[PDB]
Amino acid sequence: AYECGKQGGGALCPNNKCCSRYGYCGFGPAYCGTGCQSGGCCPGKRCGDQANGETCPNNLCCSEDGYCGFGSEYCGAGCQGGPCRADKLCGQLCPDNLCCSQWGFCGLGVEFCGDGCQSGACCSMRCGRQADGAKCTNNYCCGASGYCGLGGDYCGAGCQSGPCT
Amino acid sequence: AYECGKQGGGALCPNNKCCSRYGYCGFGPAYCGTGCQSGGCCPGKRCGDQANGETCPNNLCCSEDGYCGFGSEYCGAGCQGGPCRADKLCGQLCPDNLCCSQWGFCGLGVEFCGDGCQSGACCSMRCGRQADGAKCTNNYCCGASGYCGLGGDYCGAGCQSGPCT
Ligand SMILES: CC(=O)N[C@@H]1[C@@H](O)[C@H](O[C@@H]2O[C@H](CO)[C@H](O)[C@H](O)[C@H]2O)[C@@H](CO)O[C@H]1O
Ligand SMILES: CC(=O)N[C@@H]1[C@@H](O)[C@H](O)[C@@H](CO)O[C@@H]1O
Ligand SMILES: CC(=O)N[C@@H]1[C@@H](O)[C@H](O)[C@@H](CO)O[C@@H]1O
């Protein structure tokens, strides 16, 4: 069975393994070369202002030249996406489902996704009848018990609001 | 059909989606909370010196306190792993298959994985018959045609050295 990419339901490979053009995980030219879908593609996938605003898979950094990678060349000066070394303000959604903290910065972990989380992958953002009709952000679904999220547990049976199925 | 984690062959979810304890992708407590395997877990997965050297899935940063996340609290001062803001030296392989450039820094993209790449997910490293019996680094497989890599095309039929078949 396929492992990754279009053929694999959009899954990513573990440990920066390249997803080949055929939807399998590995390293070397056959996986990381022409048609590489994600992982440590070589060259790096195109991104940002060089890819219609598409972000890098696997949280790679998008360089000023619009290539995906890691290192100062990618995450440092001129970085236009991913875990750039520069702080990312929000208040305006964060990219890639990153949490907008109470202080208006993008990140993951409890300081961003916990108490005061404004948007993105918040830990426990309340919604629906339990929250007096509060709406979820990011077009997330409001689950039956009144938490914002995505996936079957939130968009499935009992989904109160958002893009229920 | 499982999507991710130990049920899904170690696959990751795209765009920081959490892999639930049951092997499905999504956001909210059911996915990111207790049992979260990868993605934007809340709290972050344990990592670094606090977790037997385990790295963060999805290239999250490992904080000083050994939790996975993003933002300066995770990638900045005290960062133990992932795309820390500090340059990452190598010469001591790079974690998670990052390329060790000719200059001894970890990253991905042609500057690291291309010409002069020492180890990790190098673009093209020769091995086996076609390279005077040269062995691959990182315990990669040597393909039939004499290129280093992982996956079916390299570890499968024709494999010369490394963890073949
Ligand atoms: C370059 C490419 O995609 N090659 C694929 C092979 O990967 C694939 O074999 C699969 O390999 C994956 C790991 O890469 C895993 O070992 C699977 O079990 C295996 O099937 C092969 C399948 O026919 O197609 C090649 O084109
Ligand atoms: C949780 C949070 O939002 N913290 C941010 C921090 O990540 C960022 O580096 C800083 C920049 O001034 O602003 C806040 O402290
Ligand atoms: C490809 C490579 O190794 N480049 C490194 C760069 O990442 C690092 O920031 C710099 C520090 O002086 O040294 C080199 O330029």
Helix % of chain A is under 10%
Going across the major beta sheet of chain A, what is the strand order?
A: 1-2
**Structural class, from helix and strand content of chain A?**
little secondary structure
As an assembly, this protein is: homodimer
The whole-angstrom Rg of chain A is 18 Å
What labels describe this entry?
homodimer; 165 residues; two-stranded antiparallel sheet; little secondary structure; binds a molecule of 2 linked components (NAG-GAL); globular; sugar binding protein; binds 2-acetamido-2-deoxy-beta-D-glucopyranose; two-stranded antiparallel ribbon
Provide a descriptive summary of the structure in words.
2 copies of one chain form a homodimer. Chain A is largely without helices or strands and 165 residues long. Chain A folds into 4 domains: 1-43, no CATH class; 44-86, no CATH class; 87-123, no CATH class; 124-165, no CATH class. Chain A contains 4 helices and 8 strands; from the N terminus they run ββαββαββαββα. In chain A, the strands form 4 sheets. The first copy, chain A, has a two-stranded antiparallel sheet with strand order 1-2. Chain A has a two-stranded antiparallel ribbon with strand order 3-4. In chain A, a hairpin with a 5-residue loop joins β3 and β4. The radius of gyration of chain A is 18 Å and the shape is globular. The complex binds a molecule of 2 linked components (NAG-GAL) and 2-acetamido-2-deoxy-beta-D-glucopyranose (2 copies). One 2-acetamido-2-deoxy-beta-D-glucopyranose sits between chains B (87, 101, 103, 105, 107, 111-112) and A (71-73).
